[PDB]
Amino acid sequence: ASRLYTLVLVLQPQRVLLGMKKRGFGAGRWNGFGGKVQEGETIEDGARRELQEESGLTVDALHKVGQIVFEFVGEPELMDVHVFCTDSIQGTPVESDEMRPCWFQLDQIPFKDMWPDDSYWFPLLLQKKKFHGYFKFQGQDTILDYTLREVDTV
């Protein structure tokens, strides 16, 4: 019982782009660009579409960096999140009704205003490591249990 999602990080040598979400699931946190994969769509095509819809950016090369499963206790559907990175983009980030984008230096990542699991896996993403993760949540703030391991193949 799982639903496919994508999550894209625009990660350059000295900075990362994040979006402050205005509405819906994750509102009030800095997020990467992501959402549900559609019928007849590849996971990578879904990742490229979500980045354009949410940030206004066009991506060249996407790289697979991780897979994370999220459980919310009492909710039947697991989230199966496929995580990607890119450095090569075109366009300038667009502020919309849904998202306020900002660049962060890599020593100023706003973890206090991000999903709490990011403190565990974001440091692997920054050192170009690949990973498999599982996080069990109670509500949106409390991690009950987790596993996280580095892999050669996502």
Ligand SMILES: Cc1cccc([C@@H](C)c2cnc[nH]2)c1C
């Ligand atoms: C839409 C979407 C896609 C992927 C993940 C997430 C959340 C659960 C998340 C967990 N840790 C970072 N973000 C959302 C909201």
